[PDB]
Design an enzyme around this catalytic site. Sequence first.
Site: not given
Ligand code: HEM
Ligand SMILES: Cc1cc(N)nc(COc2cccc(OCC3CCNCC3)c2)c1
Lengths: 418, 420
Positions: A289, A294
């Site tokens: 979620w 975001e």
């Molecule tokens: C449950 C609530 C969750 C929140 C609030 C959350 C929050 C975030 C946020 C803010 C980012 C930064 C990426 C962006 O700004 O686009 C992020 C990245 C990421 N999250 Fe989550 N997340 C959640 C769940 C998950 C889950 C379920 C997974 C995988 C099972 C996951 C894996 C990742 C990965 C792999 C990245 C970054 C990928 C990379 O650049 O290496 N997250 N998450």
């Molecule tokens: C499962 C999940 C939950 C959440 N709250 N937010 C995310 C977003 O996280 C990712 C994980 C991997 C790649 C990514 O996107 C990269 C682009 C590049 C530009 N700004 C943000 C999105 C964003 C995932």
Amino acid sequence: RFLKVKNWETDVVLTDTLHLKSTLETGCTEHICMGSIMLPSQHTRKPEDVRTKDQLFPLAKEFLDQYYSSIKRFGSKAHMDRLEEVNKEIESTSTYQLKDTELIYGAKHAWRNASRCVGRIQWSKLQVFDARDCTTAHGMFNYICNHVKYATNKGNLRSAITIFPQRTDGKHDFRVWNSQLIRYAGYKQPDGSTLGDPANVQFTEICIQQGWKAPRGRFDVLPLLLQANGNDPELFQIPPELVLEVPIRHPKFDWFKDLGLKWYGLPAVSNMLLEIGGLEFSACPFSGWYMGTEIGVRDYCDNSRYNILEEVAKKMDLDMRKTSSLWKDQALVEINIAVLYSFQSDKVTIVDHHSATESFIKHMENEYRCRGGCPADWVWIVPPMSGSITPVFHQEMLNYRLTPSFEYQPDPWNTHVW
Amino acid sequence: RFLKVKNWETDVVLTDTLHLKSTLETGCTEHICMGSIMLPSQHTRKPEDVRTKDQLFPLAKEFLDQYYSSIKRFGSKAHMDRLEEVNKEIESTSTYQLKDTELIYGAKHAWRNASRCVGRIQWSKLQVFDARDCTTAHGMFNYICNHVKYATNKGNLRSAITIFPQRTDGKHDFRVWNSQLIRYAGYKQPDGSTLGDPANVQFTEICIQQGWKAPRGRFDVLPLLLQANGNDPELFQIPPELVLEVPIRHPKFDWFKDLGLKWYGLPAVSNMLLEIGGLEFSACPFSGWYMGTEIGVRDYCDNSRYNILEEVAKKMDLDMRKTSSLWKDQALVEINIAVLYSFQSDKVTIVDHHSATESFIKHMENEYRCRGGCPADWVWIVPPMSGSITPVFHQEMLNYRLTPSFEYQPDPWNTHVWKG
Ligand code: HEM
Ligand SMILES: Cc1cc(N)nc(COc2cccc(OCC3CCNCC3)c2)c1
Ligand code: HEM
Ligand SMILES: Cc1cc(N)nc(COc2cccc(OCC3CCNCC3)c2)c1
Ligand SMILES: C[C@H](O)[C@H](O)[C@H]1CNc2nc(N)[nH]c(=O)c2N1
Ligand SMILES: C[C@H](O)[C@H](O)[C@H]1CNc2nc(N)[nH]c(=O)c2N1
Ligand SMILES: [Zn+2]
């Protein structure tokens, strides 16, 4: 060797020992730090790069060793017998299959080690859907829909990952061409600007290029484009009933809703590669979620996204003549107040950046005690508004790469043969 | 080897070849990134680490090489004789003196190289005051006053730096104990609350102990505490007429003034070490003008500082009951609006974060074009509010260390050997 991290707002110091398990590389050297490069080589997996028999076994041993350690049966007969079993199967088949238990532990841990993810306090509650028996795009579509419905859960969101068959010879890849399961279409005009979401312009065209009739709205849910077993991908529309959306309104400014903004509830990243014990799951959409920023800071306000700041500031009647009035900033805060209030109102799960970062600090502290550390990437963990008033700002973090992991992979359209 | 940096908002790509001239070290390795560590080992200089002939000359050569290229005289007769002169002087005295020109160039470069500084577009306009003839604290007090007065310029601020004698044997250091030349007292109270600036509590105790009679108000300018030639430091009150201050009000909120806030106009950092040509200048205060967020976000709003968010949110009668209401984010913006408004009103130079980051992006691109790179620390360059609506957030940045350079050094009170 043993390493300290300091919170400069609380003076707490944590020692890091976990980093000495780091198996993958960072991008940095003694001479140059690359902490702010979006995509160093290391963080990506190119598909040419098939695993060889020789590289695969080390990877398997290391993974099975940590697996058996976690269930406090390290160096037991079941440990040893499994290591032999996988060994034999590599020697014969050139790959191996994971037991469900391992698959689940593998997935939870890839999230656990996602050093860019602020949401990891939740890492251990992941629902894992083993789609390894899938053979077609239709099948993938069925799996995804089940994933989406289960995750949405009437607004009471639940984390999930669906895992399609692992890479083999890299000719039989399963891929979700979408970058997220649910995203809005982006269209240019003769006029020259953009309608809908500029991030998805290309992909939106790739779909139209494949037969998608597009309703040409500002918020057209894009079709899923699915590729099983290295085949051409196929278009499928997600049943609207399964796509939970939130109309965005402001708790104070009734004119807000008049911009007709809405957003989807389920963030479900689809384009990443899941690596467990040297095995490559190239289709593994996962979801949880939203942290409010975001959508509100990035999705609405990034120049190259919905860029609504100018519009909101106007309706707010702020002095847009000079940067120094902080009108952009003022508007950014309201837009974000709105998003949170809408989601909250419609009882759809969402977390504010204050709360998420607090939870992550608790999470670090937990991981320092129980595991010996927590890889974290400050550039990504600090939210994109109000940085220094969140506690993560003042937190030193060590960044390093552990396995299992999620890795980036090239956009399928640059790689697929027709 | 060539290295590429992308800007994700504009797709502008740049190429770094300058990182190839990078002597020092980062803290990172192939297996760890220490990019978010505040004071890594390599960004600091312990005074016990005083240089030998051994290591000095290469550092001297390197630097004089850089010097003569910049003035287009590489391999000049003037260049070689300077080399041999410095060499002779090192073998003979174990150290060497910088010419005026070299001090000037060294200092501009340290700044130009400061990878955590968003102010760098301005790097070439630095008034350098050479105070290498200073032998006493009183001499030190006099120099600093002239700096403050010249840099303040009745609100029309001018970058300047003042350079005191270099380290010799590390027993005879010049040092400014103050972390900035102008700063507000901090007083811990028996009930545990702090009066004045929580950052400054410790330094305030040292001052009080050294003899300062403390007004004990919310905004008392601390005295200068100054050490010359490795001697015990002495106390001095900057004359108040020299200290430009700006009372904080808000364009639309009339109750804001009643919070009783003000800040000083001149940001002037006094605890860093200037490394030029292997030489170490341990007191070298430099000054510029403020980016609003440095006061408006950090100075007032950090939990560990004046922490006025509660009071400002109270007065705006915001819903402070749930964080998800963004009452903190809202109070933060108003305070920062107020800070820019007060400074502009009083014609005291100041820059807002949008304007500073835009400039820095232009500076950075030009630095790639003509210098072949710009070392930049993203963690520090991005502003402490509204990160992603400023263009640096979307900017990939290479970080690496070049000399000349500004280093951290440990707090004098931790290392000084008291004469009594
Ligand atoms: C449950 C609530 C969750 C929140 C609030 C959350 C929050 C975030 C946020 C803010 C980012 C930064 C990426 C962006 O700004 O686009 C992020 C990245 C990421 N999250 Fe989550 N997340 C959640 C769940 C998950 C889950 C379920 C997974 C995988 C099972 C996951 C894996 C990742 C990965 C792999 C990245 C970054 C990928 C990379 O650049 O290496 N997250 N998450
Ligand atoms: C499962 C999940 C939950 C959440 N709250 N937010 C995310 C977003 O996280 C990712 C994980 C991997 C790649 C990514 O996107 C990269 C682009 C590049 C530009 N700004 C943000 C999105 C964003 C995932
Ligand atoms: C022209 C006005 C200037 C502005 C607006 C400015 C802005 C800033 C800001 C915001 C920081 C980050 C500090 C923090 O957030 O605590 C910084 C760092 C720094 N600036 Fe400036 N700067 C200016 C002039 C100068 C001058 C004149 C020098 C030296 C001659 C200088 C050298 C530095 C250094 C060395 C750092 C980083 C310290 C470290 O390594 O951790 N700047 N600058
Ligand atoms: C000359 C100048 C101008 C300006 N606008 N801002 C600065 C701030 O530069 C520095 C340079 C070195 C250290 C520092 O602060 C370090 C600690 C860590 C957290 N912030 C305050 C104290 C701040 C300098
Ligand atoms: C250039 C920079 O690395 C890039 O903009 C990064 C910075 N930090 C980020 N942090 C998050 N959470 N998401 C992002 O997309 C980015 N983008
Ligand atoms: C832990 C972290 O490195 C530390 O809080 C840094 C982060 N970024 C910063 N950026 C600036 N400009 N000033 C700072 O003091 C800090 N603090
Ligand atoms: Zn690094």
